[PDB]
Amino acid sequence: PTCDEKYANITVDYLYNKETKLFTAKLNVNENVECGNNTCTNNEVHNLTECKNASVSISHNSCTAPDKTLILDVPPGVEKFQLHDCTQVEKADTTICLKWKNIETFTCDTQNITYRFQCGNMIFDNKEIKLENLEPEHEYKCDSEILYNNHKFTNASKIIKTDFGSPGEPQIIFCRSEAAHQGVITWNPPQRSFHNFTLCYIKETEKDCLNLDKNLIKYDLQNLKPYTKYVLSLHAYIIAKVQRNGSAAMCHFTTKSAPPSQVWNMTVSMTSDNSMHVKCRPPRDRNGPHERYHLEVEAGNTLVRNESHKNCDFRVKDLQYSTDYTFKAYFHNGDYPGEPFILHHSTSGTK
Numbered sequence: 001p002t003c004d005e006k007y008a009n010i011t012v013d014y015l016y017n018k019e020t021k022l023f024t025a026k027l028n029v030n031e032n033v034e035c036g037n038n039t040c041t042n043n044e045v046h047n048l049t050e051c052k053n054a055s056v057s058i059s060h061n062s063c064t065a066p067d068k069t070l071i072l073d074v075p076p077g078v079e080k081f082q083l084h085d086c087t088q089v090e091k092a093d094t095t096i097c098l099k100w101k102n103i104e105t106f107t108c109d110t111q112n113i114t115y116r117f118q119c120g121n122m123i124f125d126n127k128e129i130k131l132e133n134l135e136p137e138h139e140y141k142c143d144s145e146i147l148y149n150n151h152k153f154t155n156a157s158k159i160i161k162t163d164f165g166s167p168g169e170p171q172i173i174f175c176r177s178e179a180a181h182q183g184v185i186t187w188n189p190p191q192r193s194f195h196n197f198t199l200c201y202i203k204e205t206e207k208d209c210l211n212l213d214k215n216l217i218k219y220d221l222q223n224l225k226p227y228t229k230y231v232l233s234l235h236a237y238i239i240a241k242v243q244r245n246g247s248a249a250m251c252h253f254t255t256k257s258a259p260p261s262q263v264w265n266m267t268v269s270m271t272s273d274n275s276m277h278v279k280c281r282p283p284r285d286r287n288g289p290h291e292r293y294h295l296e297v298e299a300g301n302t303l304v305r306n307e308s309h310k311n312c313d314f315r316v317k318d319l320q321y322s323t324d325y326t327f328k329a330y331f332h333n334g335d336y337p338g339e340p341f342i343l344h345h346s347t348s349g350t351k
């Protein structure tokens with residue numbers, strides 16, 4: 001057939017010379033072809049400017065006239081594109097973002113420029129791509145190429161590593177309280193890589209948190225309130241490109257009861273010449289399960305009266321006249337009594 005017939009579907013490969021900033025067009029043909037005015041030694045058209053059309057008329061002894069007129073639509077310079085890692089730092093442990101950047105202008109129409117990627121075995125067609133649900137602490141090879149009129153003119157590879165993902169959780173051997181103001185937590189460290197621990201103890205109203213060293217596996221909880229339930233939470237964390245907290249292990253205990261605080265604002269007031277009215281306010285810290293107010297009346301370093309009520313209101317009647325009395329009032333929570341509030345008041349009249 002005609003050379004236009006034999007070479008109607010001829011393909012070209014573009015080879016960039018970084019030193020000259022010029023392209024070579026390699027004609028994809030077996031036989032040593034002849035080119036018109038312009039020479040094509042071997043089967044290569046040399047020194048082509050980027051983004052400029054060149055015409056080549058192709059013939060061979062095996063085909064007749066007309067010659068195959070081939071238009072070389074030369075691509076942009078390879079150094080005008082850069083493969084950039086756009087990965088979001090908060091999601092670096094499970095994601096990859098890659099994007100080609102156009103670092104210098106070129107006159108070629110961008111509508112004929114296509115970008116391809118292969119990450120693992122997934123194939124993408126776009127200027128930028130995103131991979132999600134990646135396993136942390138792994139390495140992946142993402143290959144990419146750029147096409148002009150579906151012809152590859154450049155390519156690159158990017159090897160990416162995924163950051164440090166979620167450690168924890170630690171295992172509690174036991175968390176208990178053997179005292180009223182103290183508690184303890186015994187645990188085992190998690191198998192994953194971590195930087196430190198976080199302990200939080202929650203009571204009814206307050207929540208207190210602490211950062212402990214990664215080396216210790218026991219914590220002595222000090223300065224606790226008697227007869228109160230504490231919900232402990234222990235988790236491990238790591239400082240990667242962002243802080244990553246692991247799962248939290250939970251445990252609880254109620255601290256032991258203790259003697260209550262002293263009763264508040266105790267008063268003794270005369271109701272007659274031989275009778276007193278004793279009243280006080282509840283202790284700030286009851287520290288126990290039940291409620292009871294006790295009154296001890298002493299005279300001459302000897303206990304003369306011992307009364308108890310649900311409320312701190314005592315009417316001490318029919319006492320001896322002209323006698324100095326000691327009034328010891330205290331709360332009893334059911335488990336322990338409180339330190340007595342001591343007041344002295346003497347009776348009037350004469351015996």
Ligand SMILES: *[C@@H]1O[C@H](CO)[C@@H](O)[C@H](O)[C@H]1NC(C)=O
Binds near residue numbers: 157
């Ligand atoms: C293009 O891909 C080939 C493998 O297909 C590779 O050998 C070559 O180095 C890549 N080019 C660049 C500049 O990364």
Ligand SMILES: *[C@@H]1O[C@H](CO)[C@@H](O)[C@H](O)[C@H]1NC(C)=O
Binds near residue numbers: 195196211212213
């Ligand atoms: C744990 O936290 C403290 C601050 O609370 C910090 O000074 C210390 O360096 C951390 N430990 C480790 C091993 O990173």
Ligand SMILES: *[C@@H]1O[C@H](CO)[C@@H](O)[C@H](O)[C@H]1NC(C)=O
Binds near residue numbers: 198237245
């Ligand atoms: C991670 O733990 C720290 C305390 O170590 C806390 O301030 C932060 O809010 C926690 N974040 C999450 C998402 O659990």
Ligand SMILES: *[C@@H]1O[C@H](CO)[C@@H](O)[C@H](O)[C@H]1NC(C)=O
Binds near residue numbers: 265
């Ligand atoms: C005790 O009660 C009296 C009378 O109500 C009051 O003036 C005083 O401020 C109270 N003291 C305390 C410590 O609450």
Ligand SMILES: *[C@@H]1O[C@H](CO)[C@@H](O)[C@H](O)[C@H]1NC(C)=O
Binds near residue numbers: 294296303306
């Ligand atoms: C007063 O009675 C209480 C309640 O039974 C008792 O615990 C306490 O010992 C008595 N006081 C004295 C000084 O005996």
